[PDB]
Design an enzyme around this catalytic site. Structure first.
Site, PDB file in Angstrom:
ATOM      1  CB  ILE A   1     161.436  22.893  30.157  1.00  0.00           C
ATOM      2  CG1 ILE A   1     163.415  22.228  29.869  1.00  0.00           C
ATOM      3  CG2 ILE A   1     161.607  23.226  31.332  1.00  0.00           C
ATOM      4  CD1 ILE A   1     164.290  23.527  29.690  1.00  0.00           C
ATOM      5  N   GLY A   2     158.412  21.451  29.860  1.00  0.00           N
ATOM      6  CA  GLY A   2     157.475  21.331  30.769  1.00  0.00           C
ATOM      7  C   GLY A   2     155.746  22.546  29.735  1.00  0.00           C
TER       8      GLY A   2
ATOM      9  N   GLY B   1     152.224  25.439  31.066  1.00  0.00           N
ATOM     10  CA  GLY B   1     153.058  25.380  29.938  1.00  0.00           C
ATOM     11  C   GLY B   1     151.094  26.080  29.111  1.00  0.00           C
ATOM     12  CB  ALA B   2     149.165  29.333  30.706  1.00  0.00           C
ATOM     13  CE1 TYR B   3     145.425  31.184  26.930  1.00  0.00           C
ATOM     14  CE2 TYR B   3     146.788  32.202  28.412  1.00  0.00           C
ATOM     15  CZ  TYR B   3     145.923  31.825  28.200  1.00  0.00           C
ATOM     16  OH  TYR B   3     144.852  32.159  29.404  1.00  0.00           O
ATOM     17  N   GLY B   4     151.512  27.522  25.521  1.00  0.00           N
ATOM     18  CA  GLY B   4     153.010  26.724  24.788  1.00  0.00           C
ATOM     19  C   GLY B   4     153.169  26.660  25.313  1.00  0.00           C
TER      20      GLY B   4
ATOM     21  CB  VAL C   1     159.043  25.609  27.780  1.00  0.00           C
ATOM     22  CG1 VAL C   1     158.710  24.876  29.340  1.00  0.00           C
ATOM     23  CG2 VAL C   1     160.736  26.557  28.215  1.00  0.00           C
TER      24      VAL C   1
ATOM     25  CE  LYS D   1     156.696  29.967  28.738  1.00  0.00           C
ATOM     26  NZ  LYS D   1     157.200  30.521  29.965  1.00  0.00           N
TER      27      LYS D   1
ATOM     28  CG  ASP E   1     153.596  30.984  39.735  1.00  0.00           C
ATOM     29  OD1 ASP E   1     153.064  30.505  40.176  1.00  0.00           O
ATOM     30  OD2 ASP E   1     153.433  30.366  38.755  1.00  0.00           O
TER      31      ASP E   1
HETATM   32  C1  LIG Z   1     159.777  24.725  34.117  1.00  0.00           C
HETATM   33  C2  LIG Z   1     159.129  26.582  34.237  1.00  0.00           C
HETATM   34  C3  LIG Z   1     159.911  27.126  35.265  1.00  0.00           C
HETATM   35  N1  LIG Z   1     159.088  27.214  32.477  1.00  0.00           N
HETATM   36  C4  LIG Z   1     158.150  27.170  32.638  1.00  0.00           C
HETATM   37  C5  LIG Z   1     156.697  27.126  32.459  1.00  0.00           C
HETATM   38  C6  LIG Z   1     155.288  28.144  31.688  1.00  0.00           C
HETATM   39  C7  LIG Z   1     156.005  25.770  32.656  1.00  0.00           C
HETATM   40  O1  LIG Z   1     156.046  27.832  34.013  1.00  0.00           O
HETATM   41  N2  LIG Z   1     158.770  28.381  31.496  1.00  0.00           N
HETATM   42  C8  LIG Z   1     159.706  28.138  31.412  1.00  0.00           C
HETATM   43  C9  LIG Z   1     160.721  28.701  30.140  1.00  0.00           C
HETATM   44  F1  LIG Z   1     160.168  29.301  29.778  1.00  0.00           F
HETATM   45  C10 LIG Z   1     162.152  28.959  30.668  1.00  0.00           C
HETATM   46  C11 LIG Z   1     162.672  27.896  31.439  1.00  0.00           C
HETATM   47  C12 LIG Z   1     164.018  28.056  31.718  1.00  0.00           C
HETATM   48  N3  LIG Z   1     164.209  26.071  32.247  1.00  0.00           N
HETATM   49  C13 LIG Z   1     165.562  26.522  31.913  1.00  0.00           C
HETATM   50  N4  LIG Z   1     166.066  24.848  32.619  1.00  0.00           N
HETATM   51  C14 LIG Z   1     165.070  23.882  33.510  1.00  0.00           C
HETATM   52  C15 LIG Z   1     164.899  24.828  35.161  1.00  0.00           C
HETATM   53  C16 LIG Z   1     164.167  23.241  35.562  1.00  0.00           C
HETATM   54  O2  LIG Z   1     165.207  22.184  35.731  1.00  0.00           O
HETATM   55  C17 LIG Z   1     165.140  21.538  34.299  1.00  0.00           C
HETATM   56  C18 LIG Z   1     165.748  22.983  33.561  1.00  0.00           C
HETATM   57  O3  LIG Z   1     166.136  21.779  32.149  1.00  0.00           O
HETATM   58  N5  LIG Z   1     166.254  26.887  31.913  1.00  0.00           N
HETATM   59  C19 LIG Z   1     166.017  28.662  31.178  1.00  0.00           C
HETATM   60  C20 LIG Z   1     164.850  28.490  31.526  1.00  0.00           C
HETATM   61 CL1  LIG Z   1     164.435  30.266  31.154  1.00  0.00          CL
HETATM   62  C21 LIG Z   1     161.425  27.396  32.449  1.00  0.00           C
HETATM   63  C22 LIG Z   1     159.992  27.449  32.838  1.00  0.00           C
END
Ligand SMILES: CC(C)n1c(C(C)(C)O)nc2c(F)cc(-c3nc(N[C@@H]4CCOC[C@H]4O)ncc3Cl)cc21
Length: 267
Positions: free
Chosen positions: A10-11, A13-16, A18, A34, A122
């Site tokens: 998914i992406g 990620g400052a310290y990890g 997802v 995450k 953010d």
């Molecule tokens: C991506 C970003 C906002 N993100 C970061 C970071 C630290 C990288 O900014 N942490 C993230 C995290 F912990 C969780 C999610 C998240 N994502 C989805 N689905 C996604 C949504 C985007 O389109 C593709 C789908 O798969 N569903 C539920 C959750 Cl909770 C997104 C996170």
């Protein structure tokens, strides 16, 4: 963890990192997994705050299904973010009542966080999730081209304050973007972002400019506050009032999420 199978990144990620993962023990549903590294009371406290918020199961924040021990946070998966939703909506754009409903749901989620002393800091379309049923869920808060810049409040840009009003500025930017389907203030640096904001809202009163900051009011030469309808064309009178109350320079004068919920725009 052999209970989750990662299928896509998914992406970061400052310290990890997802990942979109299969939750093998719960019917193979998708989850957002995450994994957060540690080199710590600060971090322990933040996850305790996250777990506490989950006990309320607020409809407008993502569910936290599990926490495991270097730290695994398991959230419900949502297929799309608000950025993807806005990119795919056909002309002439998002329906008026859908903009109203999504903004109300966004403010309900933010009011929940702000009432429990959590500041998102953010807020952007990338972390506002849209479920298959049209429900808005806030994500990516409570821990730790730069899209973030476009939603930053002037007080963050100036390095003066970081209280709950920071999120109401982001709400205002997102509200305008629901109509425009393009960012309201698209800058390429902190100073330039502030310049582009002041080109629309005008220079605030000299007493509204924060004390003890590097950038003085004198560094910006914005002649006048332009009518917001020039940038947000389809917005109504009540929506215009709520939008300007969100885009208020002074964070103490900015509308709160609680008061915004009672604005006549939602009546
Ligand atoms: C991506 C970003 C906002 N993100 C970061 C970071 C630290 C990288 O900014 N942490 C993230 C995290 F912990 C969780 C999610 C998240 N994502 C989805 N689905 C996604 C949504 C985007 O389109 C593709 C789908 O798969 N569903 C539920 C959750 Cl909770 C997104 C996170």
């Amino acid at each position: 963890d052999q209970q989750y199978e990662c299928v896509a990144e998914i992406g970061v990620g400052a310290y990890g990192t997802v990942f979109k993962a299969r939750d093998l023990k719960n019917g193979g549903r998708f989850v957002a997994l995450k994994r957060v590294r540690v080199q710590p009371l600060s971090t322990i406290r933040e996850v305790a705050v996250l777990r506490h918020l989950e006990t309320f199961e607020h409809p407008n924040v993502v569910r936290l299904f599990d926490v495991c021990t270097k730290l695994t946070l398991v959230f419900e998966h949502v297929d799309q973010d608000l950025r993807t939703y806005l990119d795919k909506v056909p002309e002439p754009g998002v329906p008026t009542e859908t903009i109203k409903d999504m903004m109300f749901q966004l403010l309900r989620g933010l009011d929940f966080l702000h009432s429990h002393r959590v500041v998102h800091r953010d807020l952007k379309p990338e972390n506002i999730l849209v479920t298959s049923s049209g429900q808005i869920k806030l994500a990516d808060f409570g821990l730790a081209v730069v899209v973030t810049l476009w939603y930053r409040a002037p007080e963050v840009l100036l390095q003066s304050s970081y209280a709950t009003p920071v999120d109401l500025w982001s709400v205002g930017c997102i509200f305008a973007e629901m109509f425009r389907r393009k960012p309201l203030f698209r800058g390429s640096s902190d100073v330039d972002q502030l310049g582009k904001i002041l080109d629309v809202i005008g220079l605030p009163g000299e007493e509204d400019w924060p004390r003890d900051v590097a950038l003085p009011r004198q560094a910006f030469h914005s002649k006048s506050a332009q009518p917001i309808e020039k940038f947000v064309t389809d917005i109504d009178e009540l929506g215009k009032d709520l939008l300007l109350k969100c885009l208020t320079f002074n964070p103490a004068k900015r509308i709160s999420a609680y008061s915004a919920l009672s604005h006549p725009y939602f009546q």
